Structures are given as structure tokens and as C-alpha cells.
Amino acid sequence: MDVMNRLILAMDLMNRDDALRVTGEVREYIDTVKIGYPLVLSEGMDIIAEFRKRFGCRIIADFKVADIPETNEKICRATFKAGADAIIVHGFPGADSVRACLNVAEEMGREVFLLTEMAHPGAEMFIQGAADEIARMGVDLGVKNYVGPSTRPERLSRLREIIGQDSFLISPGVGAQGGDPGETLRFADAIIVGRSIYLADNPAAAAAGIIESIKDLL
Amino acid sequence: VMDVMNRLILAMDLMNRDDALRVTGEVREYIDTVKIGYPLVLSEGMDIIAEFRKRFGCRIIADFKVADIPETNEKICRATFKAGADAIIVHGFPGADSVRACLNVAEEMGREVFLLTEMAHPGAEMFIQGAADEIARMGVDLGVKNYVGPSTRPERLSRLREIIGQDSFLISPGVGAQGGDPGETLRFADAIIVGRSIYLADNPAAAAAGIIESIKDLL
Numbered sequence: 001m002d003v004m005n006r007l008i009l010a011m012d013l014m015n016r017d018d019a020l021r022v023t024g025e026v027r028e029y030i031d032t033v034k035i036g037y038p039l040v041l042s043e044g045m046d047i048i049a050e051f052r053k054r055f056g057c058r059i060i061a062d063f064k065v066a067d068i069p070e071t072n073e074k075i076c077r078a079t080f081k082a083g084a085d086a087i088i089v090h091g092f093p094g095a096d097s098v099r100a101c102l103n104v105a106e107e108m109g110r111e112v113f114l115l116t117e118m119a120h121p122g123a124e125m126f127i128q129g130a131a132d133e134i135a136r137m138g139v140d141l142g143v144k145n146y147v148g149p150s151t152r153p154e155r156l157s158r159l160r161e162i163i164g165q166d167s168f169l170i171s172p173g174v175g176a177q178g179g180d181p182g183e184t185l186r187f188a189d190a191i192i193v194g195r196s197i198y199l200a201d202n203p204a205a206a207a208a209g210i211i212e213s214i215k216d217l218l
Numbered sequence: 219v220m221d222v223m224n225r226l227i228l229a230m231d232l233m234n235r236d237d238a239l240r241v242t243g244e245v246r247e248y249i250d251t252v253k254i255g256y257p258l259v260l261s262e263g264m265d266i267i268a269e270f271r272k273r274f275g276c277r278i279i280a281d282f283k284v285a286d287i288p289e290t291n292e293k294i295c296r297a298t299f300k301a302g303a304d305a306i307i308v309h310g311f312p313g314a315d316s317v318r319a320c321l322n323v324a325e326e327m328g329r330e331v332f333l334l335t336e337m338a339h340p341g342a343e344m345f346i347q348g349a350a351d352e353i354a355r356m357g358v359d360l361g362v363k364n365y366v367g368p369s370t371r372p373e374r375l376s377r378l379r380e381i382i383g384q385d386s387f388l389i390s391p392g393v394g395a396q397g398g399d400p401g402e403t404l405r406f407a408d409a410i411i412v413g414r415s416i417y418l419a420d421n422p423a424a425a426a427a428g429i430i431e432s433i434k435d436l437l
């Protein structure tokens with residue numbers, strides 16, 4: 001996956017007008033948008049097709065899929081029917097649940113991203129202790145795309161070590177949650193940025209500034 | 219706690235509005251509580267909750283297995299309750315802050331959180347099972363009153379009931395298609411969740427009536 005400026009916009013505004021306007025304001029800087037449940041549950045799954053119509057961007061559906069295999073299959077099918085290029089799936093529920101997602105993605109020409117450790121403090125309670133094993137499970141299953149935490153660069157580096165340089169790794173928690181863009185890109189192929197851009201007085205300037213700060217890395 | 223008719227909750231995971239509405243209508247006399255998840259919501263929109271309320275006046279549990287950071291969890295809960303869901307199901311494995319975020323929104327908005335503590339499918343044994351007792355204990359510490367646990371593992375369901383106490387409310391999926399037995403599950407759960415055994419039946423009403431007949435002495 002070729003992400004423009006190594007920067008993925010997390011579009012978690014919950015109003016269609018604002019989401020479209022802000023995305024339009026930063027369109028020159030990105031070609032990949034992560035759309036999650038805050039926007040989808042507020043404005044409907046048709047928003048994905050609208051983003052493709054307006055911007056042509058690739059769309060990663062951040063749905064943190066975390067059900068039994070049978071339900072995971074249905075979620076992925078509905079998501080890809082809506083036009084998502086990729087979907088983010090939790091690894092914690094185990095291998096069969098991940099495989100269900102991989103199957104549908106293969107059938108519809110899409111990608112699965114495996115979330116292995118999360119960026120927020122609560123991640124330390126249960127997820128962090130399982131994260132290396134979840135990453136190895138990903139490797140065993142043939143997963144090629146991964147998500148890990150900007151807020152813990154030593155953990156992000158370990159994830160990169162496990163999956164290898166050939167795998168694709170994206171990382172949230174940059175800006176608002178404390179992660180640094182440049183440090184994160186030592187290990188991740190692309191950074192995910194939400195509030196630092198979409199809550200900024202001037203989203204375009206916010207995006208431009210981030211890109212300026214990592215310009216030697218592009 | 220919510221008063222679930224016949225101790226039976228329909229898992230409405232059909233993905234077509236017409237079929238979902240038809241089947242739910244057919245079992246309306248047996249069930250007043252419907253679990254709606256992402257298969258139906260991602261196919262038909264959040265307005266499906268509105269449509270079910272209008273047509274059936276059933277309680278709605280939004281099975282969204284909320285599993286994000288606290289800030290995003292808050293946004294998901296707000297949108298879900300705004301649409302009319304009575305309750306939302308939240309994963310515990312992302313930790314206490316993520317659960318608290320959902321609890322805080324539910325309190326502010328006058329709705330309920332159900333905490334999913336162990337799952338019923340085989341993959342649950344890899345990571346979730348080992349964390350489940352602690353996730354449940356965390357729920358109790360956070361003041362969670364409603365829980366979800368697996369019918370497919372009676373020993374695990376029994377332990378979860380012990381941890382949360384007799385006053386907490388416990389619902390349990392995996393009955394029927396996944397192998398769980400209705401009566402045995404109700405030894406520990408307040409209500410059973412049933413999807414395919416009902417909604418894929420030639421006669422969903424007869425399927426529901428049959429399950430209820432089998433647990434008649436427990437009602």
C-alpha cells in the first residue's frame with residue numbers, strides 16, 4: 001500500500017458536512033483516510049462511497065472487528081460491500097476470528113490490518129502481555145498489514161521486529177495521545193493522525209506542519 | 219435488571235431489512251428483547267433500531283463489542299444511544315479506561331453497559347480465556363451490573379456468575395448453533411441469546427416456542 005506523505009487521516013468527526021469539509025481541506029496532503037464507527041454510526045455506511053466519489057482516497061475501515069468467526073465474516077462482507085479497501089481487526093479474539101476476516105478480504109480483493117497492541121493506557125492491562133503472541137499469530141496466518149502504538153515506540157519497534165521489514169505497519173496515537181510523528185516513522189510505514197488535524201483551527205496548516213516535520217523521511 | 223420475556227433474547231443477525239423485520243415480527247409474542255449487531259446495522263443503518271422500536275416495541279441491545287480507546291468508545295456509545303439503543307455491549311480486554319468511558323456515557327445518557335468477559339468461540343481460548351476472570355473482577359470493581367459470558371463452556375459461565383454475584387445480570391450466547399444447551403445455560407445466566415436456531419428455521423415462531431417449552435420449568 002502506497003500512502004501519500006506516510007500520513008493517514010483518522011476522520012472521526014461525526015457530522016457529514018464537517019467531515020467532508022475538513023477532508024477536502026487536507027486532500028492535497030493525503031490519499032488515505034481511516035473511517036471508523038464514530039462517523040459511520042452517525043452518518044451511515046454510504047459515507048464511504050461518498051468519500052471515494054469526492055476524493056478518490058483509499059478507505060481503511062477501522063471497525064476493530066472482534067466477534068466470533070461467523071459474525072466477523074458478515075461484518076467484513078457488509079464493510080467491503082460499502083467500498084472499504086481494508087478493515088482493521090482485533091487479534092485478541094484469536095486465530096479463527098482473524099481467519100474469517102482474511103477469507104472475506106481475499107474473496108473481495110481487500111486487505112486486513114491486524115491490530116496487535118493498542119496505544120491507550122488501558123492497553124497495558126491485558127493487551128500488551130498478549131501483543132507479541134498476537135503478532136506471531138499474524139505471521140503464522142499470513143497477515144501482511146499491522147497496527148501498533150505510537151505512544152510506545154519500544155513496543156512499536158518490537159512489533160516491527162516480529163513482522164519483518166516487508167510487512168506493512170501503520171500507527172495511531174500521534175499528536176493528541178502523545179506520539180511523535182518522526183519517531184513513529186522509524187518503525188511504522190505510515191502514521192495515523194486524527195484530532196491534531198481535524199480539531200485544528202486550520203487543518204491544512206496542521207497537516208502541512210506534520211509533513212514538514214518528517215520531510216526527510218519522505 | 220431488565221425484565222427479559224421468557225429469558226430469551228433474539229440475536230437478529232440477518233442482513234436484509236425485510237427478512238429481519240419478518241422474522242422478528244414472527245417471534246414477537248415470545249421475545250421482547252432483541253440483540254442487534256453490526257451485521258444488520260452495517261447493512262441497513264442505525265435507523266434499523268428506530269424501525270424495530272416502531273414495529274415491535276422490543277428492548278434493543280446494541281451488540282457492538284466496543285473495543286477502542288476511551289475517546290472513541292465515548293463517541294460510539296453516544297451515537298448508539300442517540301439512535302435509541304437501550305444498552306450496548308462492550309469488550310473488557312482493552313482495559314478499565316475503555317470500559318469506564320462507556321460507563322460514563324451510559325450514566326449521562328440513562329442507558330446500560332453490558333461487559334463481555336469471555337467469548338464462546340474456539341479462538342477465545344488463545345487470549346481471552348486467560349484474562350476473563352480478571353476482566354470480570356475489573357467489571358465488578360468498576361460497578362458494571364450487566365455481563366455477557368459463554369454458554370459453550372458451562373464451567374466458565376459458572377465461574378463468571380460467581381465472580382459477578384447473584385445480583386448482577388448475565389446473558390449468554392452460543393446456544394443452539396454453537397452447541398450450548400438452553401436449560402443448562404440458564405442454571406447460571408439470567409437469559410440466553412439465540413440467533414440462527416431461530417432466524418434460520420423454516421418456522422422461527424415454532425423454533426422459539428420449542429426452546430421455551432424446553433425451559434418451561436425455569437420460567
Ligand SMILES: O=c1cc(O)n([C@@H]2O[C@H](COP(=O)(O)O)[C@@H](O)[C@H]2O)c(=O)[nH]1
Binds near residue numbers: 012147
Ligand atoms: O491503539 C489504537 C488503535 C486505534 O485504531 N486508534 C484509533 O486511531 C485514531 C487516533 O485518533 P487521534 O489522532 O485523534 O488520537 C482514532 O480513530 C482511534 O480510534 C487509536 O487511537 N489507538
Ligand SMILES: O=c1cc(O)n([C@@H]2O[C@H](COP(=O)(O)O)[C@@H](O)[C@H]2O)c(=O)[nH]1
Binds near residue numbers: 255281366394395413
Ligand atoms: O461470545 C460470544 C459473544 C457474542 O456476542 N456472540 C454473538 O451472539 C450471537 C450468536 O448467534 P447464534 O445463536 O446464531 O450462534 C451472534 O450475534 C454473535 O455475534 C457469540 O456468538 N459469542
